[PDB]
């Protein structure tokens, strides 16, 4: 299946999934002296107060902490969206060094990682249904810095051990996803797909200005993950992100100046 793996990464994913050359598809460079500022752009209203975290999971490619978005507890609004978005999983890429994890990279900058709060349009009904639209999904992309620690992070970073390998999972309640957001809500925005197979290119794009900065140790534990289940031979999860897609007939909007 597809992985990150010289014989099965990015470079072969086409094969098995066409949009891969698609035309609008994640990540992306953002040039910060050609992307638009709109000042009609609106603020982003990002209300993760009433979120309900349930549990964590190696899914092989990566970590996920799931929330319960069976109503709108943690929704996204505002910004370059119409319409209301649910907070369904977020997930992190990372790298085995600390320059390169991120997807997005800002001016040809890579960071060490990058975060991935994902949200479903509601007036879909589910989130298989949103994945058959244009507008179905908008991702909250952060970048993540190597410096002190984030004390959001950290709850995150203990569990690690009880889903070391792939299928692991832990039950994961009362985790406040605003410990993880910057000060500024500052963004750029572009409409673009997802970053892993299946691909699809369903997804608005909101990459925020400031990233967060968390520990060396802290990302440290990142890397001690397996891409394989456990009893394979232990394949350390590292990497784990896609180079650069080509922007062509697009454009970044920024909401600063
Ligand atoms: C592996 N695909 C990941 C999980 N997802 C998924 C799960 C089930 C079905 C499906 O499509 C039919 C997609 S997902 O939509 O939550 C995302 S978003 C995303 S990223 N890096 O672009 O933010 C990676 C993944
Ligand atoms: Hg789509
Ligand atoms: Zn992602």
Redesign the pocket.
């Known amino acids: 299946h597809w992985g990150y793996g010289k014989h099965n990464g990015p470079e072969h994913w086409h094969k098995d999934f066409p949009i891969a050359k698609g035309e609008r598809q994640?990540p992306v460079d953002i040039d910060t002296h050609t992307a638009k500022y709109d000042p009609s752009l609106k603020p982003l209203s990002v209300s993760y107060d009433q979120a309900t975290s349930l549990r964590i999971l190696n899914?092989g490619?990566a970590f996920?902490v799931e929330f319960d978005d069976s109503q709108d507890k943690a929704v996204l609004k505002g910004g370059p969206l119409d319409g209301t978005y649910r907070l369904?999983?977020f997930?992190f890429?990372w790298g085995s060094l600390d320059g390169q994890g991120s997807?997005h990279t800002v001016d040809k900058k890579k960071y060490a990682a990058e975060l991935?709060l994902?949200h479903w349009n509601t007036k879909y009904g589910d989130?298989?249904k949103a994945?058959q639209q244009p507008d179905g999904?908008a991702?909250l992309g952060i970048f993540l810095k190597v410096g002190s620690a984030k004390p959001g992070l950290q709850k995150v970073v203990d569990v690690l051990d009880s889903i070391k390998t792939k299928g692991k999972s832990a039950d994961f309640t009362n985790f406040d996803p605003r410990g993880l957001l910057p000060e500024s809500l500052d963004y750029w925005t572009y409409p673009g797909?997802?970053?892993?197979?299946?691909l699809?290119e369903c997804?608005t794009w909101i990459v925020l200005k400031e990233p967060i900065s968390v520990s060396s140790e802290q990302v440290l534990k990142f890397r001690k993950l397996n891409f394989n289940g456990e009893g394979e031979p232990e394949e350390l999860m590292v990497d784990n992100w896609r180079p650069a897609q080509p922007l062509k007939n697009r454009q970044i909007k920024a909401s600063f100046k």
Do not use: A, D, K, R
């Not at 797909?193 to 299946?198: I, R």
């Open positions: 994640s899914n490619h996920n369904i999983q997930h890429h997807e991935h994902v989130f298989g994945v999904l991702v797909s997802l970053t892993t197979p299946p699809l997804v």
